[PDB]
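ligand=calcium ion
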Amino acid sequence: DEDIIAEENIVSRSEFPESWLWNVEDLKEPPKNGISTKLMNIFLKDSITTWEILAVSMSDKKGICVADPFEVTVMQDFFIDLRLPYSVVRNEQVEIRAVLYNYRQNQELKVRVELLHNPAFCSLATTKRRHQQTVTIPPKSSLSVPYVIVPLKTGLQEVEVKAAVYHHFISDGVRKSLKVVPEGIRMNKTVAVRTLDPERLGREGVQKEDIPPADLSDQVPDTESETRILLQGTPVAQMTEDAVDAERLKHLIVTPSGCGEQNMIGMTPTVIAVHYLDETEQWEKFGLEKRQGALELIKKGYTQQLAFRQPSSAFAAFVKRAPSTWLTAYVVKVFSLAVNLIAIDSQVLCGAVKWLILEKQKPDGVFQEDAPVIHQEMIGGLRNNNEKDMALTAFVLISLQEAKDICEEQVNSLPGSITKAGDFLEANYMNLQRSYTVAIAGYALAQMGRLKGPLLNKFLTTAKDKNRWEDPGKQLYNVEATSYALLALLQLKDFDFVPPVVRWLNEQRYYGGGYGSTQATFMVFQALAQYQKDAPDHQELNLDVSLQLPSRSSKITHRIHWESASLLRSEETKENEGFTVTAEGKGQGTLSVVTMYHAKAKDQLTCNKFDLKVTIKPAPKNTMILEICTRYRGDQDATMSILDISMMTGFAPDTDDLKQLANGVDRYISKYELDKAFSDRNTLIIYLDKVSHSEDDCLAFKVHQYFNVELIQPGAVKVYAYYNLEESCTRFYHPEKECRDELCRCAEENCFIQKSDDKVTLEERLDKACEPGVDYVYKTRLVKVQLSNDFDEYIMAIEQTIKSGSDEVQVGQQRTFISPIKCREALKLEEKKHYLMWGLSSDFWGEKPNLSYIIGKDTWVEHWPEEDECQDEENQKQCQDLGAFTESMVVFGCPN
Amino acid sequence: CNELPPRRNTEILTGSWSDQTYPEGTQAIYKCRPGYRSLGNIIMVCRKGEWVALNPLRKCQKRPCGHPGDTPFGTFTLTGGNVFEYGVKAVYTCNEGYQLLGEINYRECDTDGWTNDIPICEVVKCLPVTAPENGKIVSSAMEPDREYHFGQAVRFVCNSGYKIEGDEEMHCSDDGFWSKEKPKCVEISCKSPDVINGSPISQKIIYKENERFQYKCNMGYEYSERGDAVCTESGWRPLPSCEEA
Amino acid sequence: SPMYSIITPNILRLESEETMVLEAHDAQGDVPVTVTVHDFPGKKLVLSSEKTVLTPATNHMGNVTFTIPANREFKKGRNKFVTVQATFGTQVVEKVVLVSLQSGYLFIQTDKTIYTPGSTVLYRIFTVNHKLLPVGRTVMVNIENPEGIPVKQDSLSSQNQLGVLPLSWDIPELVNMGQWKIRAYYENSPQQVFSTEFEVKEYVLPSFEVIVEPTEKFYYIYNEKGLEVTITARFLYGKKVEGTAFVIFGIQDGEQRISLPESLKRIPIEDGSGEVVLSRKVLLDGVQNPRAEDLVGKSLYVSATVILHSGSDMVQAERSGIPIVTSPYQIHFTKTPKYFKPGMPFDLMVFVTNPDGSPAYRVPVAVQGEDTVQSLTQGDGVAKLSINTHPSQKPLSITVRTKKQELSEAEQATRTMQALPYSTVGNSNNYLHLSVLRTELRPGETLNVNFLLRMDRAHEAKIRYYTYLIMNKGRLLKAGRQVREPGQDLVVLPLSITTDFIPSFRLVAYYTLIGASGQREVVADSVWVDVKDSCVGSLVVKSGQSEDRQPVPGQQMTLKIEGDHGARVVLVAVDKGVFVLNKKNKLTQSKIWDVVEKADIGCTPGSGKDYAGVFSDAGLTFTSSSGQQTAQRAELQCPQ
Ligand SMILES: *[C@@H]1O[C@H](CO)[C@@H](O[C@@H]2O[C@H](CO)[C@@H](O[C@@H]3O[C@H](CO[C@@H]4O[C@H](CO[C@@H]5O[C@H](CO)[C@@H](O)[C@H](O)[C@@H]5O)[C@@H](O)[C@H](O)[C@@H]4O)[C@@H](O)[C@H](O[C@@H]4O[C@H](CO)[C@@H](O)[C@H](O)[C@@H]4O)[C@@H]3O)[C@H](O)[C@H]2NC(C)=O)[C@H](O)[C@H]1NC(C)=O
Ligand SMILES: *[C@@H]1O[C@H](CO)[C@@H](O)[C@H](O)[C@H]1NC(C)=O
Ligand SMILES: [Ca+2]
């Protein structure tokens, strides 16, 4: 018009970030008193609000520092606030409110607010006509301009409103975006839950799992779904038997005293205790400080033992007594284990080893004792005669192998001595009768990996109850023998056999010490210590899971490891199609398939809490009566409720009627509402103290037309309790009701190909039908009509297949055609009636077994006259055209 | 008057102007040139031997273009002014570790609107890394040979009996190259330790994993704690030592 | 005669500089010292080795600083230990100390507090050491859903990032609603996980904010007036709001909420303001209990719903946690030592707070039985009460009451604590007392430390100095000597307070001698001193343009950033509307210091059952060649 900005010259505010200015700055400016100042230029966003700017600094010297929030208020004299809901349902008539603000202290502005057109939405605004309202906004006041729209397609849609003031160089606009959600209700279907365990559930080391597509029989037409494939590792702790409590070993710490034999007896407990405590790491409970005192006892025992070392490097109870083979071998056994604790002279250790080999070993590989020890109780099980050569040779051999890593470089004959000693055990092992010898000899052989076949079988079978090696006599020999067996099993890596054996040792509740306990004490703790050392931190978890989606280019593999076991790995697919899951490797995992989709809601999603009935009738330049009825759906009456009412364009409530409603009667109307003149009063709020849940609470008032327009927007009424805004009920009202509503007519434009059979010609049909786009053409009879709240289903019977494509439907079969309720009035389909239908391939819905059709904008739906009507001369033209059309398609088909 | 309405610097004529002399009170409508806005046509009129301005107050100003828009991981500056008006350019720049997709990094505010599209910034990426022989990649966000991006770090661990050779960790640097070179996994070995104030008892120099090195101390010195060393993936544990005592 | 002692923190942290104090009491000439740190118990590796010389010029006192390497040897669930060995010439003094994997701190900042499905979460991770200084290390980041299940893992390095690690996560359109977590930790120390929460919800910005403000933060149970509340409604840009308000009250016991429907009031909003009152009568009627005393311990919440006259805008606001109390104040002894020295002044650090937990300013406090012992709380809500203790082994009992004029004795806050006698070596009756002036201490001020000595005249002359050590941020910050002349009961130490002392520090002092039955004796004491919380440097954001100029949408603006030179400043702008929906988990300098204070190895305000306890409670280990040493510490955390 005149004195106003052109719509095209106005650029609406679109930048409304909830957060921005995510930038970085470096204070490199010359410091003033340690403070550097930097001027930063920024461009403010479109949002009309206060910004809170937070700043954090990092310095090499000063460190981190968080500054106080600095606020920035951004405002305009004239602006628009377009209040859009987070999301709106498709094909549901909703009302949005555009509020115009004028903060000029004392100056009224004449504004023309316009709602731009958008193919996605259906409003009074069209490509042909603009939707404009000219309103007056008083100073220090705001005006609410209602808008009724209907979303057509789902997804992030855009709404834009512009405005310009007359006689002033001022303009503004808002361009926000809202989400459009399908009519259905969000739902999740657990398709499959499979445990992944290749080694255990799979074949040849691989496990295959075929997953079915989701049912989705109730899925809302023309809505996409998404299937999640969730993979997660299953961490499994290693079941390891608890270690012997450190407090139990307080007695093991002993001060070494006596001569050549007793010095070792007292040194044994302390050495094995410090060894066990180190492995199990229990110095925390035992006493961190105490360890040093223990080592001093070990050094003390070592130093004193040297005094009994003879020139031959052998050992005996006395310096004048003949050297003992066993004693010397034992000294090597303990000393070799103590090299980790204290300083052990190689010359002493290796010297004893070389003496045992060159002086005490026979050509056959047997070690012989020429001078038994005085303390026969310190030798443990070796004391019970019988197969002494096997027992003694094994004992000495064990000592040699433990000293190998230390004395192999100094003793050239050691490797041969070990092999020759093993040769003897290997040859005479099967003859052994006593469990003790079998246990100790088995361990010696196992060290070389020479315990195989029959020998291994004998060793394992000798154990009673698969948990212990025992013999008639003192228990200490059994505990000792079983300890040797445990060490052998650990050497064999036989994890299956160990647990019962270890459990038996622990249940014996033996913690060393006492008379004749040297061997039992030393062996039991060495075996238990080794068990803890070999024990794995956790069960191995290294799965290789791969997904095979029929619609994916290549396989998707996932490497599931222990460190990332809990990590939830996901794969998403739009298509509802079966797939295969292959997993292989060690460890366990979980496979879950869930499908999110919109399922048709049989019940009403809206107005679940409030019942609302709005009626509009002509009053006895115009007047009408607006009567609103409401009832609360609950066990008790509702609390204070709000009546958000919006007038029809050009209409306003009566001041007199409002005053009468304002008067008590549990109805409150703020004075602010009462004051507004008949002009610019398109919004009204009526507060109710409470509404009945037993019956309807009805109120009514008059409305007067002040402004005259061609296209009249329908009014709206919203009821809801103060505490809950979500649970509300909105009803629209408009004259001509006791469809012409532009909003109603616009919505049904894309229901199907709109046309009159009269304008339609034979040649026209042949031209359109043969087009490659058209996939199917059927002569159908409507067998049944199943109406619903959101989508109507029409069960069509295929009487003739004029043209068939993807859907290989035979004559006599039935197909279901679907269409939104908004199109029911436009289609006007009736049972027992025939129709000529054709459409695109994109119309298909579901899969082959239950393939359905969706009546879209490109769908041709022409009523086929019955034989009764065809006899009429007026219907002759159409009946004959349809007949010739069918003949040309069936006989000749399409050109090519 | 006796001429044709003057050609303004920012306005344009709408009439054909074929006549020579024009009657009194004749309004010469001036349209607003592209990239400019106003309430209406700045209308001139002929009176008193000159073309005066019927609309003195009404004037054409530079057409305002909306916000150029911000791109993820990027910032922009304005060129040729400090307002989003016709004739200004919005130059974009990607953040550290981000590279500009394309070579057009600007948006020029033109008569209709901003020119081009909002420049896109993409995080720099480094070539995928494979597992070293006899070694594995403990770190990383899974996925075998998936191109990493700025920031991601990678660690390497060798299998039992093997020790790494080179840097243990690395990360995708700013230019899309790894901060360090990929390491190798070499079989564990140890050279014969030089014991200060002491001498080796053994003659062997090369040692494998878990092999023990024996040594004695020169007179006047004695063992610092233990009396031997063990070969490990990290070296000799403990290290040979002789303290005065 | 010579006694060689060593001092280290109770817990040694990896990849951080640790200090060790070395001394040679009653020693002569030069004393060579070598310090080594081995792993426990194997002694496989020499983690550190330092050398120093203790000459008479340094009073036979010196220190050794060592940084334990992040060896892969310290690797489940079992605590690791190291052996600190100091060799003073021939004498060898060793000690086993606990080890912490904690490398430093990680602070996570998200651009917003709440997000909508389909939006991007921009967050920064600040990597710093124990001294809050920027470092370059490998960080592990996990995005955890409401269930507690991680939906995304990543490993990044902060090297060349100046301690600032910019990250981002895209929220899928389909996502579980609720509180989402961001877990982070250094690669070297997985145990120590730093977290930050952000809510995922479907929402739209309010348009205007509503503030529910009670006249008193609390409600006195015997207040006839009842709970008075002011409802403030204003647009986000500033302009005041005109509309109608729906206000209702309720009671909360734990997580159980009881609504008070009878209190529901509809009040008009005039010029962006309105008032509503919850009468005591309605409050007592709402509950089924006649006894009003029972309500004490519970809280009240106020729900307000403001609707504009346009009917296009509606906002829900609420204030919960309004304590129903009998007293406006609350007394705490958390900052007061639980041990006293018989025959010496016992200093109490009374902590008075409001029902909400905030400090109380200028609140009179005193000890029952001693009116003379009255004091006034500082800005931090702390007051000092010094009582004179008589020589006895009887447990000391103190009851502190507020003497706030204008209040009745029934409304005065009260609390009672018990203090145990400091056990002396061989019952020698030798004690040491440290006292510090109770006033808000700031970097740049000088703090006078008082050393009060108590012991028999026969041995008093022997003491010629006090050894003091300063503990800050979990490590030794400073160590020195305080000379003393024979006969002096008190000596003052002019201690300079620098930014290093932030946010707080402990001062532990001790002396040693040979008294009685030729027994080597160690007497120690410690005090906890609080320092004004603030940034070591400074950072400010203000306008760079004339104040007359008001920001317009799409207009250019100039910001003035003044801070430390060479510092990297990261910025962010958030719409106040976002805070209306959620204001939880906002990064503040105070929250950073909170984390630092939590990590503190010290567990007590000061003192202890004995000299050994004095060191351990402060987070220190003491070990001498003669035999005196602190007990072992195997706990990473402080006792409950
Ligand atoms: C354990 O011991 C260490 C030292 O062994 C303690 O750290 C030291 O603390 C002292 C104060 O007790 C600090 O003095 C500060 O020095 C700054 C200036 O910065 C520093 O200056 C030092 C000067 O010495 C230099 O020696 C080198 C080598 O020969 C020469 O090249 C150079 O020309 C100087 O002669 C320098 O060593 C540092 O590297 C750095 O430049 C001063 O501003 C300030 O005051 C100083 O000392 C006193 C006041 O106390 C004053 O009279 C002097 O004039 C001087 O201004 C600082 O106090 C040092 O930071 C530390 N010294 C060293 C050697 O590093 C540590 O505190 C202690 N730890 C614990 C827990 O007890
Ligand atoms: C999925 O279904 C469950 C069970 O009905 C429901 O509790 C949950 O809210 C739904 N959402 C998802 C995706 O878990
Ligand atoms: Ca503080």
